Design a protein around this ligand. Structure first.
Ligand SMILES: [Cl-]
Length: 274
C-alpha cells in the first residue's frame, strides 16, 4: 500500500485544503471487494469494503460525514500469523463509534499484539473544533502520536520510513499539489491519480529487501514503485480525499474491474461535513 497526505488544520485562506490525500491499495486481485459507497446506520460512512469470507465489512480507508477518517497499511513481513485478528476492523470500528482519534489509538495499542503488522491513521475532522490526525503502528513505538501539520507518507514500513518509492512518490505528490491545487479541484484530482499510477520502480532499496526478506525478493522489481504491477498482486484502488477549508469533501476511487488492467471504474462523491 502507499498513502500521501497534506494536513493543515488552520488554513490561511478560504479555498485552501485542510486535507489532500492520495492512497493506493495493493492487494491480491483474487480478494473480493466492493466499490466505495455510503453505508452505516445513517448512510454516514463512505468507504470500500473487503468481502473476504469471514472478514466481510472490513476496510482500509474511509470517511464519515460526522467528521471521522482513518486509513491502514500492512507491515511487510516475511511471514504471517494466520490465527490473528483481521486488520480490516481497525478502520471500521473507528468510523462506527464516537471516540476521538487519540483515545481510539490508545485502545488499539493495548491490543496491538493481536494483529499482524499494521500502521493506523485516525483523524477527527471538525470545522469548529479543529482537525486532529494521530498515528499508531504495532511494529513501531507503543504510544500513539499526535501529528503536526505537514505532508506525510506512509507505506508498508512505518510512517515516514525512507523507502525510495515513498520518497519518490512524495516528491510527485508535492509537485502535483503545488502545480494545480489553486486550479479547479478536478485537475488536482487528475494530477494525483497520475501520481498514483506512476510505475517507475525506485531501486535498489536495501530497506525493502531487509524488511521483506525472502518473501519480497520475487516481487522486488515491481514492488518498489508507487503503482505496483506484480503477478496477481498490486495496485487495485486509487483513492483521493479532499477537505477544503469550509468542509466540502471530495472522495474519488478508481478501481480495477476486469483484472485485465483495461477495465476501470471510478466513483467520486462530493458532499459536506456536519
Ligand atoms: Cl455495474
Amino acid at each position: 500500500c502507499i498513502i500521501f497526505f497534506k494536513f493543515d488544520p488552520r488554513p490561511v485562506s478560504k479555498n485552501a485544503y485542510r486535507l489532500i490525500l492520495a492512497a493506493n491499495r495493493d492487494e491480491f486481485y483474487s480478494r473480493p471487494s466492493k466499490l466505495a459507497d455510503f453505508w452505516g446506520n445513517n448512510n454516514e460512512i463512505l468507504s470500500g469494503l473487503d468481502m473476504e469470507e469471514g472478514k466481510e465489512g472490513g476496510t482500509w480507508l474511509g470517511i464519515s460525514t460526522r467528521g471521522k477518517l482513518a486509513a491502514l497499511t500492512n507491515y511487510l513481513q516475511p511471514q504471517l500469523d494466520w490465527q490473528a485478528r483481521g486488520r480490516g476492523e481497525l478502520v471500521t470500528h473507528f468510523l462506527t463509534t464516537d471516540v476521538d482519534s487519540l483515545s481510539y489509538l490508545k485502545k488499539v495499542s493495548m491490543e496491538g499484539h493481536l494483529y499482524n503488522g499494521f500502521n493506523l491513521i485516525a483523524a477527527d475532522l471538525s470545522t469548529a473544533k479543529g482537525d486532529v490526525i494521530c498515528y499508531y503502528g504495532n511494529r513501531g513505538e507503543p504510544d500513539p502520536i499526535v501529528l503536526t501539520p505537514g505532508t506525510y507518507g506512509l507505506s508498508n514500513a512505518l510512517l515516514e520510513t525512507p523507502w525510495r518509492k515513498l520518497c519518490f512518490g512524495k516528491q510527485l505528490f508535492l509537485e502535483a499539489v503545488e502545480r494545480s491545487q489553486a486550479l479547479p479541484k478536478d485537475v488536482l484530482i487528475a494530477s494525483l491519480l497520475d501520481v498514483l499510477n506512476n510505475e517507475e520502480a525506485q531501486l535498489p532499496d536495501p530497506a525493502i529487501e531487509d524488511q521483506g526478506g525472502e518473501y519480497v525478493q520475487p516481487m522486488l522489481s515491481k514492488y518498489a514503485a508507487v503503482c505496483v504491477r506484480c503477478p496477481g498482486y498490486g495496485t487495485r484502488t486509487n483513492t483521493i480525499i479532499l477537505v477544503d477549508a469550509d468542509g466540502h469533501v471530495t472522495f474519488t476511487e478508481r478501481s480495477m474491474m476486469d483484472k485485465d488492467l483495461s477495465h476501470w471504474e471510478t466513483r467520486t462523491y462530493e458532499f459536506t461535513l456536519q
